[PDB]
Design a protein around this ligand. Structure first.
Ligand SMILES: CCC(C)(C)C(=O)O[C@H]1C[C@@H](C)C=C2C=C[C@H](C)[C@H](CC[C@@H](O)C[C@@H](O)CC(=O)O)[C@H]21
Ligand SMILES: [Mg+2]
Length: 184
């Protein structure tokens, strides 16, 4: 009943310690939701974009370790808004294994410093709402330490922000998603 896509920040500002933590966060969400009706898909972005697995590819090989282990960090600039547009148009496409009546969830993992993107969040967030995608944001590094990055996380997340913005250092986001999925 639910299709969950990950969009993870592989840009130069993300230190390898945090990138590693993104990989274990994503893997743990998948591992915890195994034996459920959830499909998973993941894109890494910087100034380039890498689909590491589609929903269909997860369905054919639902092994979180096998799917996430070979992921290496892109480095480069931070095109978060374009990444969101590509997730919506490509990952949640039926050609890639996305399902018609599935509950759509996007989990964006970033430090909240979009940089060099020709697109603004105003260019892509409406499209995300148009396709019914629920957006959770997982902050990393110093995302919560300045007002600019805090507000950027809020801008990406579905409303209200306090229900959709979380940290990579814990699994509160997973608890919330599990609760949402249970209720739904
Ligand atoms: C891009 C060519 C340019 C501007 C001439 C240059 O000399 O560029 C330097 C100077 C500085 C002002 C701005 C830069 C922008 C991108 C380059 C990866 C580089 C490193 C800063 C960058 O690593 C900061 C991270 O935040 C990247 C990201 O995560 O988006 C850095
Ligand atoms: Mg960056």
């Amino acid at each position: 009943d639910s299709d969950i896509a990950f969009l993870i920040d592989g840009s130069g500002s993300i230190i390898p310690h945090d990138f590693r933590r993104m990989k274990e966060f994503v893997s743990t969400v998948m591992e915890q939701l195994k034996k459920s009706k959830t499909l998973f898909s993941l894109m890494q972005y910087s100034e380039e974009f890498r689909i590491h697995f589609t929903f269909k590819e997860f369905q054919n090989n639902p092994n979180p370790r096998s799917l996430v282990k070979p992921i290496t960090q892109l480095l480069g600039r931070t095109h978060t808004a374009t990444g969101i547009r590509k997730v919506v148009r490509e990952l949640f496409n039926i050609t890639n294994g996305a399902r018609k009546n599935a509950f759509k969830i996007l989990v964006v993992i970033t430090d909240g410093e979009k940089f060099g993107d020709p697109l603004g969040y105003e260019d892509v967030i409406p499209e995300a709402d148009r396709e019914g995608v629920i957006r959770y944001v997982i902050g990393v590094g110093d995302a919560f330490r300045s007002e600019k990055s805090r507000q950027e996380l809020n801008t990406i997340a579905s409303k209200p922000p306090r229900d959709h913005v979380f940290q990579v250092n814990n699994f509160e986001a997973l608890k919330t998603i599990q609760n949402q999925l249970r209720e739904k």
